[PDB]
Amino acid sequence: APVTVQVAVDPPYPVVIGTGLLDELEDLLADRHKVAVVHQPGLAETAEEIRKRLAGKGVDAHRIEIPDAEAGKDLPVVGFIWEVLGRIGIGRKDALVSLGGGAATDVAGFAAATWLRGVSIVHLPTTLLGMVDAAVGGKTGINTDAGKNLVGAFHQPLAVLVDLATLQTLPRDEMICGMAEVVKAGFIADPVILDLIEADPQAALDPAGDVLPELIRRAITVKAEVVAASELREILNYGHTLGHAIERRERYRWRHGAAVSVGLVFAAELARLAGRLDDATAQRHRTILSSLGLPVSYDPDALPQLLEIMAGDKKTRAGVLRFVVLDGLAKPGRMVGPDPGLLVTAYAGVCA
Ligand SMILES: [Cl-]
Ligand SMILES: [Zn+2]
Ligand SMILES: [Zn+2]
Known part of the structure; x- marks a missing residue:
């Protein structure tokens, strides 16, 4: 059954x-x-x-x-x-x-x-x-x-x-914040997740529909496959570099999923500006996330405090930031120690 x-x-x-x-x-x-x-x-x-x-x-x-x-x-x-x-x-x-x-x-x-x-x-x-x-x-x-x-x-x-x-x-607001990890799974390894959500974004949120059970199965499969397949696991951090910093900045008063959503949008703009991700796939992060009701922007003057926060994260070695970025839909890659001006410009693409 x-x-x-x-x-x-x-x-x-x-x-x-x-x-x-x-x-x-x-x-x-x-x-x-x-x-x-x-x-x-x-x-x-x-x-x-x-x-x-x-x-x-x-x-x-x-x-x-x-x-x-x-x-x-x-x-x-x-x-x-x-x-x-x-x-x-x-x-x-x-x-x-x-x-x-x-x-x-x-x-x-x-x-x-x-x-x-x-x-x-x-x-x-x-x-x-x-x-x-x-x-x-x-x-x-x-x-x-x-x-x-x-x-x-x-x-x-x-x-x-x-x-x-x-x-x-489950309240609607928790359903929406859980969908950010589902969307992340779609961009990193299973674009059918994205196609299903796009058909109708609101049907994706319906615990009685037939879409949500399929999205759950697919997102769990992506995670199961990553974990079974020692650093490939870092792809699951997609959107989390800035996302964890935002959570911290707000003293964990934002839902995890909302922060990741903004981090995804940021990661896409970072990849787009680095010449690594096509404009269409990049723009698709904001359109899918915003259609589900998730935030896609954050405080325009917060970068300095966010940078200092990311500075102290466990993944940061000798002050060097690391980000998960896409080289195409479902082609996750890495960006280590990006130029500060590039982050500033990516942040402005997201918040202004
Ligand atoms: Cl909880
Ligand atoms: Zn929870
Ligand atoms: Zn997460």
Whole structure:
């Protein structure tokens, strides 16, 4: 019944896409002695239902509620999760289930990665961004005093269950910000994603339509294929060089997807001015993103503060900025240490 995308790492794991996946979760974890469901607050009820269905099969099943959103990835939260796994007596053969957006899958994933040096985790992402991106690929992380996105671990999930029923209650604004990673996947490796969205941009956002389920499958496949195929993975940062800087500048008060959207537009203008990307494919970034309702511009006077921010990013070595750029649709390449005047000119092409 559901579609499954296999992530061809070693060992491989499935990303299951379908409607009503609790049965598949039950049969998957039926034989574990203990399971802890780590969930964000608005999902207490789905978590309690998972817990009961599990306890029904004989699992000593627990739910662990963590703060919503970015508050949920903070070091004290993972400290709390560890203490709870201990109190419950979660062992090496036991399992965690994450239920929530990207922050939940990241913190629950980091906790599973480090508890007894690694226990199995199943991810149930409940946001579009979580489904196409954060839950696939095994990157986990937490927020510490050092900054965000710095501390983490690679830890592949036993499985990822992408339950489309859950999209029916997702607010429109979260749907739109999840679509920025789908669009990114389209530009880097699967232009059919772009063609499908262009047919009708508003049908792409409809959790009941037939387009969104296909876009999800395709975006997950692009990520699965990149991850299975050590630096090709950097292509997934497309739009994120400026995007992460904007987020930071706004103190994480902008949606991740909105910042990436502006970063994509910037990356396209950078490539266009460098002579690497044709005008048509370059312009297509702004037209697709703006048609979905995503921002395509940012504060015209922010470049100096953005440059200083990008200066300190982990990828920056000896003050040298690195960007993912396209040499054509689905032909990702790199631009290392671009001339400052070129960034200034690209930024003006985006903001003015
Ligand atoms: Cl979240
Ligand atoms: Zn999220
Ligand atoms: Zn992203």
